[PDB]
């Protein structure tokens, strides 16, 4: 169970992606990962967003629940910090898939918003109407409830 988690962490801590920094285990939990996501998409590239990866005791049969610790104004993220990633959903999941692959999918969805199946119809509609207005709101939010860019 945790054995694979330790391996995945050990591997990722040696060759971390340019969009994932400060990746380490929780102070009192090896099943909880702590990392800072560095989106390149504007204006999310001005700051960083901390994410909390929660590994289930039935790993890897059960998908790791990833949530945002900080607050990201993205149409694919909720006001609390929940997300809808098909790669780790109860509708689709493969035990052969490693957390590294999930992190990639997450990064892609964070950078490239999905106006087809979003978590915020309001933000999705706004983005598909006025990118500048949306950018303004997202910018102030990123520089308000976001972690400093590492």
């Amino acid at each position: 169970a945790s054995m694979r988690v330790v391996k995945e962490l050990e591997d990722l801590q040696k060759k971390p992606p340019p969009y994932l920094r400060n990746l380490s285990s929780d102070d009192a939990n090896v099943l909880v990962w702590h990392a800072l996501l560095l989106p390149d998409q504007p204006p999310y590239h001005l700051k960083a967003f901390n994410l909390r990866i929660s590994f289930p005791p039935e790993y890897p049969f059960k998908p790791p629940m990833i949530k945002f610790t900080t607050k990201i104004y993205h149409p694919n993220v909720d006001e609390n910090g929940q997300i809808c990633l098909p790669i780790i959903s109860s509708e689709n999941w493969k035990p052969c898939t490693k957390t590294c692959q999930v992190l990639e999918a997450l990064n892609v969805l964070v950078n490239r918003p999905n106006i087809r199946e979003p978590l915020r119809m309001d933000l999705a509609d706004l983005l598909t109407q006025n990118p500048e207005l949306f950018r303004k709101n997202a910018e102030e939010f990123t520089l308000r409830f976001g972690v400093d860019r590492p």
Partner: protein
Amino acid sequence: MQIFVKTLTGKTITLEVEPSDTIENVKAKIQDKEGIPPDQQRLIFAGKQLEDGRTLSDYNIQKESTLHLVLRLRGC
């Protein structure tokens, strides 16, 4: 009769339905203008959930009634 369908996003739309209109049909009318899939359409009225096979007469829904539309996202 014209009713008011308010989503959790605050977005409130006007819907024309008759007392004999079935909830399932109501969902179709909502998707017709908005696009939200009926599978993710959870209509709440006065705290009660509107059953697809029920009509507006069942829950005693009058005109200008404001329904609360909760979206059921199936992707987690």
